[PDB]
Amino acid sequence: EIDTILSTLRMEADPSLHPLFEQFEKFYEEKLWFQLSESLTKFFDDAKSTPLRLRLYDNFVSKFYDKINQLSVVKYLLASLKDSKDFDESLKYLDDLKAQFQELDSKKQRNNGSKDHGDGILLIDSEIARTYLLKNDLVKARDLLDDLEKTLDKKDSIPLRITNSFYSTNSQYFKFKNDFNSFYYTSLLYLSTLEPSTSITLAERQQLAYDLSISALLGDKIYNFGELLHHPIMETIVNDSNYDWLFQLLNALTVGDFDKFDSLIKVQISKIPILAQHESFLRQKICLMTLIETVFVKNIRMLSFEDISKATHLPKDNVEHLVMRAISLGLLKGSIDQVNELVTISWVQPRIISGDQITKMKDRLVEWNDQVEKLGKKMEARGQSIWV
Amino acid sequence: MVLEATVLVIDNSEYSRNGDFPRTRFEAQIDSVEFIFQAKRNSNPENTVGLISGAGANPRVLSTFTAEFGKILAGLHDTQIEGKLHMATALQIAQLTLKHRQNKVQHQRIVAFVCSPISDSRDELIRLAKTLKKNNVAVDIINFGEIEQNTELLDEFIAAVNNPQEETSHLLTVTPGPRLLYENIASSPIILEEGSS
Fold first, then answer.
1. Which chain A residue has its CA at the smallest distance from B22's CA?
2. What range(s) does the VWFA domain occupy (chain B)?
């Protein structure tokens, strides 16, 4: 029956995918369908965008729905339809498969009485939202995204896999409007909760690596730069030509060397126009970073407009325009004195903490520790008698 | 035999959707519980059955010792499939449950279904095997997991427990072809057992 169809796909397949094909025949017969789940994963990794995949899954989907794991079956379909370039094909396939599942669970959930099929509904649904973002329907996708989110929250536990699919619909939506900041934050959520399992390629990771860095440079408040270098995405992608100078910019921003950033960006701005249309922002971005960072590393909280002028390489006019932007952005709050030529900073925004910063703060605690101990020595000595 | 309190350990795994027993191996082990409960019951009516799971990162107590089949059942429903049975922890949990009994006269016994090739060390479970027989706890390892190919770690375990002791450890290997689990368990000794002092 199915024994014949596996055999015709096999003949048509490359001899690359032949030894993997065999395992499907053996396991089906022996009825050892856990080793069946392993074989399908193995097969799919190196044959993702082959046309034997989609055909093959069609056979299997019709036969089992609850004789192998619900989580396992649906994730195969999602990776398939990403790679399917006919988007119409995707929208149709999804709706029919979801319906089946909805009908299936009235009877199956109770008979097995330990297996749930309503986790499958969600896994599918995330992809229905993605498929509209391919046909460039923002309205339709947004409606599904508010609903996906409320469902997520209702459960008292989430699998990794569901919340992954949820951050994926999200990511593609935000980057169409071309909103940088909104994108960056989302992507962090997706990266952490991700599976160990490779069903995500190097290509995807590297594409996300390129988008996240664009977002951080062309951003206006992302000082989580250090987080990319201390997180695998950007740390291990350094090795292509693109990701040498890109990596460096981020290293430049932190230490605040204005020369290094400037020099590298002149060469690269021609080649890539995404940086080129946000240039006003890009050039000011490093200036914003040094302005907040000087305040942090000083104990006190006030700077002369003379100091600021040196540090950013700006005139006194443009020093004042720079503090005013920064406040407007909400990096700094305080007061501006033009008649004492001070900025008296009153709050600085939190930020991440690296090794260096750890010690800086540590040292300041040392003085205040002493002040408590000796002030307390004076109080011991007066009214030593009265302590009743 | 008689006067014996039994924690049955039902194995819960991702190998319990297999078609090697119809309809799946999970649902077969469901029926298996019922038959052993009644068998013990009709030999002598002071016997009790507890039920524990393997689902979870660690096994869990769903039901302590009761004379009600139906309480044992609400548990099996409640329980998942997606965990893995680790014998070392399952044994240790069964023993604590065994220190609570309807009458303290009653002997100590573990019945363990296996649907998971053991991934615990051999050596870990040799120490534990020597732990059981001090208390007079024997373990009947119904093996149908290592028929998917895996070497018999179990030969060592059943043997370590085995000694003068009127509760006896047993090794039953069930036929790999379709033929219904529970039937085969029910027809093998569980009341037609004997002592070994």
1. A31
2. 5-190
